Amino acid sequence: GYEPCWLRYERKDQYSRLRFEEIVAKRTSPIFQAVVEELQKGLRSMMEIEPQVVQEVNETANSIWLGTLEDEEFERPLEGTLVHPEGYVIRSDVDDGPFRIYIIGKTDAGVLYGVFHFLRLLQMGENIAQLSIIEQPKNRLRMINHWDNMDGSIERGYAGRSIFFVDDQFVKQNQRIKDYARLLASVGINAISINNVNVHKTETKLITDHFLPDVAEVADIFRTYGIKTFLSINYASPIEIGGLPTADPLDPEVRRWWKETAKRIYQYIPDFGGFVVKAPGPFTYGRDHAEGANMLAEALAPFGGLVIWRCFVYNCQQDWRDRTTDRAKAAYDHFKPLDGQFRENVILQIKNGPMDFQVREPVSPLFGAMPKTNQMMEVQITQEYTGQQKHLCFLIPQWKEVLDFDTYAKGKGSEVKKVIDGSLFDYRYSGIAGVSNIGSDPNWTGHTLAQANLYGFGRLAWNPDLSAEEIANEWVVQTFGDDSQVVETISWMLLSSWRIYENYTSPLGVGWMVNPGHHYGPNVDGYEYSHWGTYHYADRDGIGVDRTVATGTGYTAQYFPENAAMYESLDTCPDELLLFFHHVPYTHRLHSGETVIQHIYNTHFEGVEQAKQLRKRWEQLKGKIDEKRYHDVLERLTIQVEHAKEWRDVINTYFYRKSGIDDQYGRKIYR
């Protein structure tokens, strides 16, 4: 019915097998049961062996040992250094007797992640004769947000319908949920919100007795795979389903209603993760988001729940005429002032950028600006503005640029990753969340290669220091095999895809220029005169948003001095973000030597040629990939090439018609 994605566990040849007679499972918990089953599955499929599962080591048998520190006979030094609950150690016994692999986790979850790491080593064909590994995740929260609706639709879903809901109910099918959990767990994802942040009528009832049994059934599966379950809530629930006259967070009965709702939820799901909130809301009653979030936080506190408060807030009724109002400044101006007013179990979830998941956006100034408030970054795996899984776009490189961005909050070495992993400000709760890119499509992600974005998200969530190169390598090998041509080719495609897509879309960081509504395809003035605050201000002389303090919106001042100065100056501002920070003449000379207008022409003409190359390189792999996936991808790559041509021409023509400046190289621009 559907692909196994990167958990193929392809059968090894006779020269790449392992000899094991037993699996020693020191524990019998539901998680351990899933761990054992997964190990059996991988070893059976890959090695064609079926070790017996036991609870005590057989001194003379080759074994894989699974357990926690408390299960050890002799606690060696390495595992003794473990402090993170989800951390683990994998080491081969150094003695000369039977072969033994020890997978030691700080907790059961640790053993689960350790096993998937062990299986990953096998899929990649690593020598496990002398292993000595210690791994602890950097981010406490490694979450996935689903924008699934209960009618089956998925907001911004380009990979089919929801695998959770249908006909305003839960799918009677749960086997796919189990395989999805296995996939998420394989890359360390430990938290999930199953419903759209835009909570509609039916979804509002997910926190009521009518649907809680079903939610609990889903949570039971995820729990088995070390995944905590969350629900996006409707802030107006007290009114819509509570029978109350208001949703005011300060109203005594409203506060009580939520506390009772929390209690009720925990009776079905004892380890419920908490609420994800997109917010009639607090503003409706003159309350600020601290008051709004803290009320929900107080309801969940007794149960250990968390409130994930999204900071995607802005004036969705902005006047395009007013160049003093800047949507990019909204998030910071709204939350920065509230630092230190939020309850301990509240985590502010902030998008990587201050606008809205554009192909390229500078880093949200909020990161590093709130020392006393937990923060978590939200990235979008589903490609809303990045190709919608029609165009290939491996998002890992972009996410690393964001994660490695130094905010200088506490001087050099204050990278975003250190802000969200909680080390910089000692955040009790923090991490990263990704908007799911899956659907009912057999290949899960619409575009076969988009599977790499989900895999990659998990890898970065676990350890942001991993290189895009090794993440791509791991994914390709596990998904398509180790043929050097296949690996080198697909890895190259993945690693260069984002830049290629940006080349023929929005120029120099200004973003947008997409069709309104569905957001797919070129439309330079699409939202140019809208009330969404997404403008490029292109005219016959130049383009760009002046966000300088000197003459613009003053957005640059939201960054710490080092970055503020870099963007403030027209001479130091990076080319790739120039139009996001400065309004400049088309003739303005970039650091690359190109005028702004010629740069536009260059990347659009050249981006299309690069897209053709992606397709050509893929075609050269025919015969080395099964026919089904070969054609699924070829189909998409062709769709990409044809659409890229539309992006190229629409943008080139628009700017030629406005600037009146011809392409330096005389390439075809339709007048």
Ligand X SMILES: CO[C@H]1[C@H](O)[C@@H](O)[C@@H](O)O[C@@H]1C(=O)O
Checking DSSP bridges between strand 88-92 and strand 274-277, what pairing results, if any? unpaired
Task: Choose among its own copies, ligand X, none what residue 253 binds, the Cβ cut-off being 5 to 8 Å by kind.
Answer: none
Which residues lie across from 543 on neighbouring strands? 584
HEC string of 278-297 equals CCCCHHHHCCCHHHHHHHHH
- Member of 9, 113, 147, 462 binding ligand X (CB under 6 A): 147
Select the residue interacting with ligand X from 52, 198, 485, 664 (CB under 6 A). Answer: 198
Binding partner of residue 329 among ligand X, its own copies, none, CB cut-off 5 to 8 Å per kind: none
Cα separation of 268 and 266, whole Å? Answer: 5
Nearer to ligand X, 379 or 409 (CB): 379
Task: Read off the amino acid at residue 637.
Answer: L
How far apart are the C-alpha atoms of 379 and 376, rounded to whole Å? Answer: 10
Considering the rule CB under 8 A, would residue 525 count as an interface residue with its own copies? yes
- Does residue number 140 form part of the binding site for ligand X (CB under 6 A)? no
Number of residues forming the site for its own copies (CB under 8 A):
25
Taking Cα atoms as reference points, which of 192, 191, 187 lies closest to residue 460? 187
What tokens appear for 364 in the block?
A: 């949200």
Q: Where are any strands of DSSP class E within 264-359?
A: 274-277, 306-310, 346-351
Active-site annotation holder among 135, 248, 356, 502: 356
268 binds ligand X (CB under 6 A): no
Query: Radius of gyration over alpha carbons of the chain, in Å?
Result: 26
Among 2, 312, 408, 492, contact with ligand X (rule: CB under 6 A) = 312
Q: Which of 101, 119, 197, 363: binder of ligand X (CB under 6 A)?
A: 197
* Of 299, 293, 298, 295, the residue nearest 313 (C-alpha): 293
Is residue 278 close enough to count as binding ligand X by CB under 6 A? yes
| 88 vs 647, beta carbon nearer its own copies | 647
Which of its own copies, ligand X, none interacts with 540 (beta carbon under 5 to 8 A by kind)? its own copies
Asked whether position 662 contacts its own copies by CB under 8 A, the answer is no
Of 70 and 322, which has the nearer Cβ to its own copies?
322
Q: How far is the CB of 585 from its own copies (least distance, A)?
A: 13
Among 517, 593, 623, 666, binds its own copies (CB under 8 A): 517
Contact pick of 539, 562, 635, 662 for its own copies (by CB under 8 A): 539
Binding mask 405-444 for its own copies (x = CB under 8 A): ----------------------------------------
Residue labelled with tokens 């996006």: 232
Figure out which of the listed residues 146, 156, 161, 643 binds ligand X, where binding follows CB under 6 A. Answer: 156
Q: Angle formed by the axes of helices 468-480 and 396-403, to 10°? A: 150
Torsion sign (Cα): 277, 282, 288, 290: negative
**540 touches its own copies (CB under 8 A):** yes
**CA–CA dist 671, 642 (Å, integer):** 20
Can 151 be counted among the known catalytic residues?
A: no
**Which residue lies nearer to ligand X by CB, 196 or 602?**
196
> What's the CA gap between 545 and 304, in Å, rounded?
44
For residue 298, the partner it binds in its own copies, ligand X, none, with Cβ less than 5 to 8 A by kind, is none
- Residues within window 282-321 making contact with its own copies, judged by CB under 8 A: 320-321
Q: Which residue type, as a one-letter code, is found at position 205?
A: K
Query: Going by C-beta distance under 8 Å and a sequence separation of 6 or more, which residues neighbour residue 321?
Result: none
Handedness of CA 466, 470, 476, 482 (dihedral sign): negative
Question: Which of 124, 660, 662, 664: binder of its own copies (CB under 8 A)?
Answer: 660
**Which listed option, ligand X, its own copies, none, makes contact with residue 156 (CB within 5 to 8 Å by class)?**
ligand X
Nearer to ligand X, 316 or 550 (CB): 316
Q: Is 356 annotated as a binding residue?
A: yes
Q: Name the DSSP class of 662.
A: P
* Helix/strand/coil (H/E/C) assignment for every residue in 570-636: CCCCCHHHHHHHCCEECCCECCCCCEHHHHHHHHHHHHHHHHHHHHHHHHCCCCCCCHHHHHHHHHH
User: Residue type for 449, please?
Assistant: L
Task: Name the active-site residue from 135, 384, 415, 421.
Answer: 384
619 labeled binding residue = no
Q: Which position's Cβ is nearest ligand X?
A: 198
State which of residues 273, 545, 659, 663 lies at the interface with its own copies (CB under 8 A). Answer: 659
Tokens for 544, please give them: 């760009």
Q: Which residue, 87 or 281, is less far from ligand X as judged by CB?
A: 281
- Residue 515, SS3 per DSSP: coil
Stretch that binds its own copies, among 74-82, 147-155, 172-180, 517-525 (CB under 8 A): 517-525
Give me the least distance between CB of 156 and ligand X, in Å please. 5
Number of residues that bind ligand X (CB under 6 A): 9
CB of 646 to its own copies, least distance (A): 8
Q: Residue 632 corresponds to which tokens in the numbers above? A: 């699924």
The closest alpha carbon to 421, from 86, 142, 138, 189, belongs to 138
Q: Is 644 in the site for its own copies (CB under 8 A)?
A: no
CA gap 425, 404 in Å, rounded: 17
Residue 532 vs 580, nearer CB to ligand X: 532
Q: Is 384 a catalytic residue?
A: yes
Token digits for 635?
């189909």
Angle between the 175-186 and 108-123 helix axes, to the nearest 10 degrees?
80
Shortest distance (Å) from residue 650 CB to its own copies: 5
670 is a contact residue toward its own copies (CB under 8 A):
yes
Q: What is the DSSP letter of 95?
A: S
Which residues are part of the catalytic machinery? 356, 384
Binding residues (CB under 6 A) for ligand X: these are 147, 155-156, 197-198, 278, 312, 356, 384
**Which residues are known binding-site members for alpha-D-glucuronate?**
155-156, 198, 310, 351, 356, 384
Binding site for its own copies (CB under 8 A): 320-321, 515-517, 522-525, 528-529, 538-541, 649-650, 653-654, 656-660, 670
Which residues are documented as binding site?
A: 155-156, 198, 310, 351, 356, 384
